[PDB]
Design a protein around this ligand. Structure first.
Ligand SMILES: *[C@@H]1O[C@H](CO)[C@@H](O)[C@H](O)[C@H]1NC(C)=O
Ligand SMILES: *[C@@H]1O[C@H](CO)[C@@H](O)[C@H](O)[C@H]1NC(C)=O
Ligand SMILES: *[C@@H]1O[C@H](CO)[C@@H](O)[C@H](O)[C@H]1NC(C)=O
Ligand SMILES: *[C@@H]1O[C@H](CO)[C@@H](O)[C@H](O)[C@H]1NC(C)=O
Ligand SMILES: *[C@@H]1O[C@H](CO)[C@@H](O)[C@H](O)[C@H]1NC(C)=O
Ligand SMILES: *[C@@H]1O[C@H](CO)[C@@H](O)[C@H](O)[C@H]1NC(C)=O
Ligand SMILES: [Zn+2]
Lengths: 99, 596
């Protein structure tokens, strides 16, 4: 598991970067690591005996929305039993009535 | 495009690399300490070699950024820590020679044994031999024999090594733009930068001299009382006005005077406080001791132990199946791993050691948020002082009565308090002159005021003038007496203990005053006092990010070392000694010697 550390800019909402080019820190042009030219990717070191603040958390950031669409696949609805030969208030697939 | 940004990025990279490397090394070390096995040694060696190689590689790249072009006072400290040439200033052969000389000195000290005359098949090694004799013998000739022997066999095999050690260390110190190696050690207290809190390297000597000039009367009275009392056990070996022989102080070197309690007790009829029987009669275990310590620490508002501490830290000896090293130690492996390694028994001494170690752990846990390079104490004295204040506060009779370990009808008298104060004094007050003198002699040797041929002529001369102890036999320049100690033969500083002892009583006085305590200081408990804990927290979380003067001022209220609380803590004992020795003589003369 990896995470970005250096970048010569800030991010914007919902942006993803996969770039692996080396990061420049000095005036001189750069070719390869060595001097002030660091690799902008560093990995984690998760172990089972870490403290509570360093143990890995599987984090589902459900940053979900995007509701609007020609289609609207929906959340699930509850159904009840059916009663016959009696005066009831019925709702069938959005058709609402009494009888 | 500036230098500050590049330095910031460099420290940012180093911070993330060092955490993983140090965690691997610490885990390997702990795994070795739990067992004793060859593969554990192999893993520890590999991890240590990798960590040292990484640190050495990272040290070189940090010199590219000049120290004068950066004005932040926070990254500057980290760069100063990193920009330090360790021992690479000299050529490779000189560094190899220095490593060899240090290893030879350590090996010579570690495996030294002395054999009884005319009995080559009976040789002892100090722990159950010399030092045991040193601690539990009332004879005279045996103590002198052991004291002279140990030095005779060890110091002459270390002096020629020490000469080259001093020469090479001075060469390295001058190559590092310093004055000498003593200045190199005094630099730990050096503060430069923010105005109003500066502390030059030379101010420490003057501060120590001024502070020690005030302790002399109490030490004089205590020395007079001890000398008067010891004339009953050694009737024909102690001068009425002379100095105390160094081989009758209950220790190999005289560092502590604790083993003289059985000879100088004021009231032997009335017994002291010992709750071991109460511990046994209620079926107590190590877990109960540790949870009682945790309860005491939470009583003042501090946080309590993480769940992992109750799992990964061993509390009792595994037994014959395994083989561990029983020595209390607080381990901070990093990344939220805090552990305690101690073999616990049902005894009051362990009941206090648990508090000392848990104070260690609390102080370590306080500054976990600071960067990696700043995760330490303000100086080399705060840590043990914070550890020891809890141990002093947890032994009060009021606390013992409150927790049910003592009978509620035990009427505490004004006669047991003198016994407790004397027992504390014999182990606290009686060690400051020794430490001060040793550090002063070492500084004088490193500076160059003492030529090579006038070392011992000063070493025994300072003793008579400060500590009040006289050598029982004459010595020439071949001997190297100070090297017999662990902290001298191995490269270690010694001014930590004086500062720690002076800081602990000042902190205790501050907390007791903040706790609305009425009465003498020796009967003070910081339990059930939130105001006495929060103040301490203001110092706990600073770490090394601020000068030690500011950290000290944040709790006590003064930015300089002080001695008045120490004398205030021993006021009734001082009055009792003044009343008792009205018919005796205080002071010593440097003319009487046992051998002449
Ligand atoms: C300690 O030693 C025992 C047997 O000697 C072994 O079973 C165990 O795995 C060892 N543990 C470690 C951490 O070395
Ligand atoms: C120094 O740098 C630290 C971060 O490294 C920053 O928090 C602090 O504000 C800086 N000092 C000043 C005076 O800006
Ligand atoms: C010691 O430090 C100086 C900078 O203060 C540097 O120029 C020199 O090369 C260093 N020597 C080493 C690393 O041996
Ligand atoms: C003290 O320890 C107890 C025992 O788990 C815990 O419930 C409590 O939260 C701790 N106190 C603090 C301040 O963490
Ligand atoms: C602290 O307060 C608690 C709660 O009143 C009490 O049970 C305990 O005995 C007190 N401890 C001391 C040392 O007074
Ligand atoms: C303790 O108090 C008694 C009160 O009768 C007094 O005589 C004595 O001198 C005091 N000090 C000692 C050490 O007993
Ligand atoms: Zn300690």
């Amino acid at each position: 598991y990896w995470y970005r550390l250096f970048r010569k800019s800030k991010l914007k909402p919902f942006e993803r970067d996969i770039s692996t080019e080396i990061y420049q820190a000095g005036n001189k042009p750069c070719k390869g690591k060595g001097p002030n030219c660091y690799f902008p990717l560093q990995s984690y070191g998760f172990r089972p005996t870490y403290g509570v603040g360093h143990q890995p958390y599987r984090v589902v950031v459900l940053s979900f929305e995007l509701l609007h669409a020609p289609a609207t696949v929906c959340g699930p609805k509850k159904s009840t039993n059916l009663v016959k030969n009696k005066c009831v208030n019925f709702n069938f697939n959005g058709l609402t009535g009494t009888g | 495009s500036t230098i500050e940004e590049q330095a910031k990025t460099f420290l940012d990279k180093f911070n993330h690399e060092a955490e993983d490397l140090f965690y691997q090394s610490s885990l390997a070390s702990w795994n070795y300490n739990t067992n004793i096995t060859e593969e554990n040694v192999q893993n520890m060696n590999n991890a240590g070699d990798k960590w040292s190689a990484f640190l050495k590689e990272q040290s070189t790249l940090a010199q590219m950024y000049p120290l004068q072009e950066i004005q932040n006072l926070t990254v500057k400290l980290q760069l100063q820590a990193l920009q330090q040439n360790g021992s690479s200033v000299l050529s490779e052969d000189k560094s190899k020679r220095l490593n060899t000389i240090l290893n030879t000195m350590s090996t010579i000290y570690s495996t030294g044994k002395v054999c009884n005359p005319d009995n080559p098949q009976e040789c002892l090694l100090l722990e159950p031999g010399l030092n045991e004799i040193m601690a539990n013998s009332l004879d005279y000739n045996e103590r002198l024999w052991a004291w002279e022997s140990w030095r005779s066999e060890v110091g002459k095999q270390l002096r020629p090594l020490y000469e080259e050690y001093v020469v090479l260390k001075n060469e390295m110190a001058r190559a590092n733009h310093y004055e000498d190696y003593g200045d190199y050690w005094r630099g730990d207290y050096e503060v430069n930068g923010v105005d109003g809190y500066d502390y030059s390297r030379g101010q420490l000597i003057e501060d120590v001299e001024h502070t020690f000039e005030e302790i002399k009367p109490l030490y004089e009275h205590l020395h007079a009382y001890v000398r008067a009392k010891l004339m009953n056990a050694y009737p024909s070996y102690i001068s009425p006005i002379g100095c105390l022989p160094a081989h009758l102080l209950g220790d190999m070197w005289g560092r502590f005077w604790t083993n003289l309690y059985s000879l100088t007790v004021p009231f032997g009829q009335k017994p002291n406080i010992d709750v071991t029987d109460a511990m046994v009669d209620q079926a107590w275990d190590a877990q109960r001791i540790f949870k009682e310590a945790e309860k005491f620490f939470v009583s003042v508002g501090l946080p309590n132990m993480t769940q992992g501490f109750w799992e990964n830290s061993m509390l009792t000896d595994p037994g014959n199946v395994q083989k561990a090293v029983c020595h209390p130690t607080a381990w901070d492996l990093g990344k939220g791993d805090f552990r305690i390694l101690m073999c616990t028994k049902v005894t009051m001494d362990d009941f206090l050691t648990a508090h000392h170690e848990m104070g260690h752990i609390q102080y370590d846990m306080a500054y976990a948020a600071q960067p990696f390079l700043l995760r330490n104490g303000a100086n080399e004295g705060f840590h043990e002082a914070v550890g020891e204040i809890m141990s002093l506060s947890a032994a009060t009779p009021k606390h013992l009565k409150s927790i049910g370990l003592l009978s509620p009808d035990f009427q505490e008298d004004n006669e047991t308090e003198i016994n407790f104060l004397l027992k504390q004094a014999l182990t606290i007050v009686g060690t400051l002159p020794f430490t001060y003198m040793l550090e002063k002699w070492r500084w004088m040797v490193f500076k160059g005021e003492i030529p090579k041929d006038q070392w011992m002529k000063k070493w025994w001369e300072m003793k008579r003038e400060i500590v009040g102890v006289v050598e029982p036999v004459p010595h020439d320049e071949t001997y190297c007496d100070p090297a017999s100690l662990f902290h001298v033969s191995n490269d270690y500083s010694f001014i930590r203990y004086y500062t720690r002892t002076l800081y602990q009583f000042q902190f205790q006085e501050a907390l007791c005053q903040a706790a609305k305590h009425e009465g003498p200081l020796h009967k003070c408990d910081i339990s059930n006092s939130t105001e006495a804990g929060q103040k301490l927290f203001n110092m706990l979380r600073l770490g090394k990010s601020e000068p030690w003067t500011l950290a000290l001022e944040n709790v006590v209220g003064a930015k300089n070392m002080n001695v008045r609380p120490l004398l205030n803590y021993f006021e009734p004992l001082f009055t009792w000694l003044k009343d008792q020795n009205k018919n005796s003589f205080v002071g010593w003369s440097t003319d009487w010697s046992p051998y002449a």
